[PDB]
Amino acid sequence: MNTVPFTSAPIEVTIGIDQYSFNVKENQPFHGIKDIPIGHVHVIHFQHADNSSMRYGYWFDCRMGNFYIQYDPKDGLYKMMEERDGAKFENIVHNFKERQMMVSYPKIDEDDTWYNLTEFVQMDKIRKIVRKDENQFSYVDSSMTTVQENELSDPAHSLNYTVINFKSREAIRPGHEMEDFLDKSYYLNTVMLQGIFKNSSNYFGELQFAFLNAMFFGNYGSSLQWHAMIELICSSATVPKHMLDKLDEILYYQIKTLPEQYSDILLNERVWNICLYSSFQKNSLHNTEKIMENKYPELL
Amino acid sequence: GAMNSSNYAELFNNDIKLFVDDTNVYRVTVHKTFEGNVATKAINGCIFTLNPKTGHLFLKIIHTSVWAGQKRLSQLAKWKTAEEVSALVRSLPKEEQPKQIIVTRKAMLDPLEVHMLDFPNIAIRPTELRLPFSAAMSIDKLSDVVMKATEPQMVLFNIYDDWLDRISSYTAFSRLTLLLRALKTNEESAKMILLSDPTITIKSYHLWPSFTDEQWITIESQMRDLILTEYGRKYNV
Numbered sequence: 001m002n003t004v005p006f007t008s009a010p011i012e013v014t015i016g017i018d019q020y021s022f023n024v025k026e027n028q029p030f031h032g033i034k035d036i037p038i039g040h041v042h043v044i045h046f047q048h049a050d051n052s053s054m055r056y057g058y059w060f061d062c063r064m065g066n067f068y069i070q071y072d073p074k075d076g077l078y079k080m081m082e083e084r085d086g087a088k089f090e091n092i093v094h095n096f097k098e099r100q101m102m103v104s105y106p107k108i109d110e111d112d113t114w115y116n117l118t119e120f121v122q123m124d125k126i127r128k129i130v131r132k133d134e135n136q137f138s139y140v141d142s143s144m145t146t147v148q149e150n151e152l153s154d155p156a157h158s159l160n161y162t163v164i165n166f167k168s169r170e171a172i173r174p175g176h177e178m179e180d181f182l183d184k185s186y187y188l189n190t191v192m193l194q195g196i197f198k199n200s201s202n203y204f205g206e207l208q209f210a211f212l213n214a215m216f217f218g219n220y221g222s223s224l225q226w227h228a229m230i231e232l233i234c235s236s237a238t239v240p241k242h243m244l245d246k247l248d249e250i251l252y253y254q255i256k257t258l259p260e261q262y263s264d265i266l267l268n269e270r271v272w273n274i275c276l277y278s279s280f281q282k283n284s285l286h287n288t289e290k291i292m293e294n295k296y297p298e299l300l
Numbered sequence: 301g302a303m304n305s306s307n308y309a310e311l312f313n314n315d316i317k318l319f320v321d322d323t324n325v326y327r328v329t330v331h332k333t334f335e336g337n338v339a340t341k342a343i344n345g346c347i348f349t350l351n352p353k354t355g356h357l358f359l360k361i362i363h364t365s366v367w368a369g370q371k372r373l374s375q376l377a378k379w380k381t382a383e384e385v386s387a388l389v390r391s392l393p394k395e396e397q398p399k400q401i402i403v404t405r406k407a408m409l410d411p412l413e414v415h416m417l418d419f420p421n422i423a424i425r426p427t428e429l430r431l432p433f434s435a436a437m438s439i440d441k442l443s444d445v446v447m448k449a450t451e452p453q454m455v456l457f458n459i460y461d462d463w464l465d466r467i468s469s470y471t472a473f474s475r476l477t478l479l480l481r482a483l484k485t486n487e488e489s490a491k492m493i494l495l496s497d498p499t500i501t502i503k504s505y506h507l508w509p510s511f512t513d514e515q516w517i518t519i520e521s522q523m524r525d526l527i528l529t530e531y532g533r534k535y536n537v
């Protein structure tokens with residue numbers, strides 16, 4: 001198990017670690033989070049008590065370095081930093097653990113939720129969507145735009161998701177206009193899977209990362225991407241059976257984890273109704289259809 | 301965006317534009333079978349593609365053979381329309397290609413947009429005008445060429461005959477839409493009005509009779525009366 005220590009907590013803030021969250025008071029003796037499960041990416045996220053504007057946070061993997069958080073009073077936020085001195089880091093952590101100044105990552109043993117939401121998400125792929133090569137961790141916030149959003153503005157601070165556009169020459173072969181528009185299989189299997197993503201695991205990784213940025217930061221562009229990647233599969237007549245079964249599992253756990261009160265701002269009625277009741281795959285997502293109908297029957 | 305009464309004069313400016321009406325592309329008769337089921341029989345149709353400034357009509361005849369062995373014909377017909385409009389644009393010299401294509405039915409928007417992806421600078425627009433272009437098959441010479449066709453064919457017409465020698469394209473379009481609305485509302489009475497007087501004929505190279513300016517005013521009044529008369533009959537007014 002790994003640890004992300006905090007130098008201090010000078011401003012009152014709600015801190016998220018993956019799907020968990022807790023409140024820290026202004027100048028409270030909080031010095032970080034311990035017992036973080038090795039083997040998964042993680043996200044540590046923030047919403048200031050005195051200014052709920054800008055949720056922001058950092059994706060990281062404790063296997064890649066020793067990371068800590070320190071508040072910057074000039075830029076007004078909690079920053080992740082890497083500590084290269086290993087013996088210094090271990091000594092700091094040990095002192096904070098001995099004084100019980102850290103919260104424990106509150107994982108229930110039976111509980112596979114985080115694995116189920118990040119099964120295909122890898123830190124190396126995050127660092128290509130979020131481009132800041134001098135750090136091993138990746139900053140995301142509520143306002144960051146996507147490359148597609150920008151084409152329709154600072155490119156250095158953008159989310160480089162794979163652009164999906166159903167009315168684009170990339171999606172539609174000359175001479176196959178009706179075929180390719182009504183059946184997205186070409187665009188899914190040849191252009192996206194074989195051409196861009198290389199395999200379904202990378203595609204699902206990006207879909208899962210988009211959902212998590214939408215949920216944890218309220219990132220509008222992340223939400224558009226997550227819906228787009230679902231619709232592309234659902235709107236294809238020819239999808240490998242293993243991908244449909246995996247998608248059903250991915251979506252089931254996403255819909256299960258979504259805060260009920262954010263359902264209005266995280267689920268798009270036109271896209272879900274199409275995928276569940278009209279698309280080629282309307283009958284291929286049994287677990288997702290069942291949870292959607294029991295948890296959000298209004299949206300449908 | 302959409303084309304309506306507010307921006308109506310835009311139809312007669314110097315930016316090349318075409319209306320595309322697909323109503324008459326897929327045409328059927330419905331009938332009982334020997335076993336007492338119901339079956340359709342397609343008949344030849346047409347795409348109505350019109351430049352409202354010049355009167356140039358590109359009438360693509362849709363021969364029934366294009367439906368042979370195809371499924372979901374009402375859907376296919378929209379995509380075939382878009383394919384053929386796209387082919388027409390590509391066939392025109394650059395300086396004759398439209399800057400806007402206005403579809404009379406919103407269901408044509410996505411098919412045409414997808415077929416025209418290679419022309420990102422041609423705007424594809426709907427309209428809030430209710431245009432009576434379905435009644436084109438009430439113009440005898442157009443109906444004749446469509447029904448006689450034995451293969452796909454494109455025939456070119458000027459739907460304003462020689463009117464633009466005497467009137468503006470705003471007035472010509474208004475005359476056309478009034479004639480077509482009257483033919484749509486009561487075809488027999490409309491044709492009676494247009495042909496009642498044997499001394500006024502249709503030139504070999506025209507679609508409509510050779511009315512003088514004063515006679516066109518009489519005809520237009522009689523067409524408006526027909527439309528109002530039918531409205532009264534319909535709604536018991």
Ligand SMILES: O=C(O)c1cccc(NCc2cccnc2)c1
Binds near residue numbers: 223227228
């Ligand atoms: O516009 C909405 O009703 C809505 C509702 C819930 C979530 C989102 N996210 C962005 C989004 C996703 C898909 C399509 N358009 C937008 C939008």
